[model samples]
Target: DPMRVLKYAILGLLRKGELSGYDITSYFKEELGQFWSAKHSQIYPELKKLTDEGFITFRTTIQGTKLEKKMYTLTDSGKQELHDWLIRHQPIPETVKDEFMLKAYFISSLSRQEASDLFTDQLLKRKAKLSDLQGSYEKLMASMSFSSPDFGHYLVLTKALEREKNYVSWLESILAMID
Candidate 1:
């Protein structure tokens, strides 16, 4: 069972310290932004469920007028839960869902120039993504120390950067053979 991988990710996020739902959402946007995405809407309910399960707890804070926030932290059990999941061996066959590859499979119908143009556009798009990932990687390495709690998150970003660069190289090779 997938066991809702989102919960594990949330537990990992709370490992640092307490954070409001909004803060967790922002963490996903920046730290885990490369491989994972979670909106505030998806996070809040998971926080509630985790609280119910004794994995997390939250304190409610109300501002002067109308702003209220719930800050969440992991319990001891939550830490153990994360550890157990991490140590468990669960392997599944890899799956791929690539729209571009699907199009290529049916490329016989399109004109040669049209196919080449499509591949050229794909190459350009992937290059732009690689550039962005590189910039993010540099900025992250500059701001965070290797000993910081954020180091693990920083490592994930590096993996993303590598994957994006690989895609860029693959696209270049495909573009060379397009025509």
Candidate 2:
């Protein structure tokens, strides 16, 4: 499952620094917001699983918050696990699955307003998502200070964001012509 890959990614970041579950989730939400969307439900359970396997460890700190937060740290075992996966795993295959496109492919049965609304809503959502990703990326790039930069991640991230932005723009132009 992709969950394993996601776990590996979380571990890689944890190896960089001991981050609270909230912090870890936020990093993905803010940095890799386009490629990866993680929720607390997904994170806490995987963290527990990794901790149980001795691959990771967590410490609870009250921090004067209403509820104590558990900060996750990667163990030596976690580093090894991440390394193993890096060598053994294949790259995640990219695929696009747009429900609007599927609906449009068989759009003849729908009214003009229905089709336009469906696609306009889809374009609006895509544009909003891309705008958020682009803005987040600008902030991340402006402040990034990697001791050892991963050019691979940098290149792919830029490429993906540009690709999505371009598509969103093309979609808007097409929708504009629909009238």
Candidate 3:
């Protein structure tokens, strides 16, 4: 189910090595941040579920001055689960789930000026997103190796940057032609 996806994502992170709960959260916030949307609230409960399922385990350790120090690691079953998922080809959705774009399809109901304003606001958001992705991609992956954890990131970040840049340019064109 939906929870399984989050479980698998966490298990995959632990596959790399044991990580403190904080480190795991950082992966979704700073590292593989964009691909998975999770918060501390969601992660801890999922971590508990994963433990109860025996797919993963954790041990308490010391970190920082007084922060929580529970470190999570994948059990063999968890590794198998991740490997199984990696090799499987599942159903692919034919449509994106972008609500804003869905709304855009009915923008004819809005006046030209109003629609222009809509696109203008969206363009700013898109532009800022592109800037962040572009900056992080360039500044982070200057020298990466094929086998490094950084490798998969560069591959996706390449696509992320391209898509973000493409989106910004597309919005720019829409704004330019709107009124």
Candidate 4:
């Protein structure tokens, strides 16, 4: 149900504005980075189903001699459904599930070269994600109008952003010690 809850959240957001699945992905990446996680695998099928169920509409545009991406829009019923669901939705506590952190807990089992490679791969990903989060955090702070219900949400997000940044720095330091 959490997966469907995520889809409904995405659908509600699309109700606010037409979005390609890619746009929805970026919305999750940039805006809901802390609170929600939705991957492409989860979004694509839901978009199709939402259209088939008449809960949403899709329009395909041509680009480079190909039927390009479909843009999805929520219908009126979809909008009402979103609103109704929001009223009934219970608040769920968030939990962390970091595979890399779990791995690090027993990283002593790995040989130096093995540890180096695994951390190297992970650091590359974490660095890129941290960079994106930092950029988004700065833009959000700079663009703050200071009157939305969402700034409080961003306050929590900012702390997560800071934690990720700190983790990246700490990881790099450990890496330096190892090499």
Model 2 lDDT tens row, 130-162: 887677567657653355375545665777788
- For model 4, residues 1-179, the per-residue Cα lDDT tens digits are 34577658677678557888888888787666577768999888888877777888988876689769878888987888788887886767685787788899998899989988887887898889888878877777666547885766587577878887888888888888777
Best by TM-score: 3
Better of 2 and 3 by TM-score: 3
Candidate 3 structure quality by residue, lDDT tens digits, 1-179? 55367887888888778987678888888747766768889999989988999989898886677766888888988899889998988888698688889978998799999999899988899888888887888787575678786787787788788888888888888888896
In model 2, which regions exceed 4 Å deviation? 1-3, 65-67, 89-95, 141-157, 172-177
- All candidates: TM-score: 0.88, 0.73, 0.89, 0.60
Order of all candidates by lDDT, from best down to worst?
1, 3, 4, 2
Q: What's the lDDT for residue 62 in model 2?
A: 86
Candidate 3: residue 10 Cα off by (Å): 0.2
lDDT value for candidate 4?
A: 0.79
Residue-level lDDT for 95 in candidate 2: 62
Worst 10 residues of 2 by lDDT: 144-153
Model 2 clashing residue pairs (backbone): none
- Tell me how candidate 1 scores on lDDT: 0.85
TM-score of model 3 (CA atoms): 0.89
Which has the better TM-score: candidate 3, or candidate 4? 3
lDDT of 1 by residue, 19-82 (tens): 8989888978885777677998899888899999999999988868889988888999999999
Each model's lDDT: 0.85, 0.76, 0.83, 0.79
Q: Tell me the lDDT of model 3 at 107.
A: 88
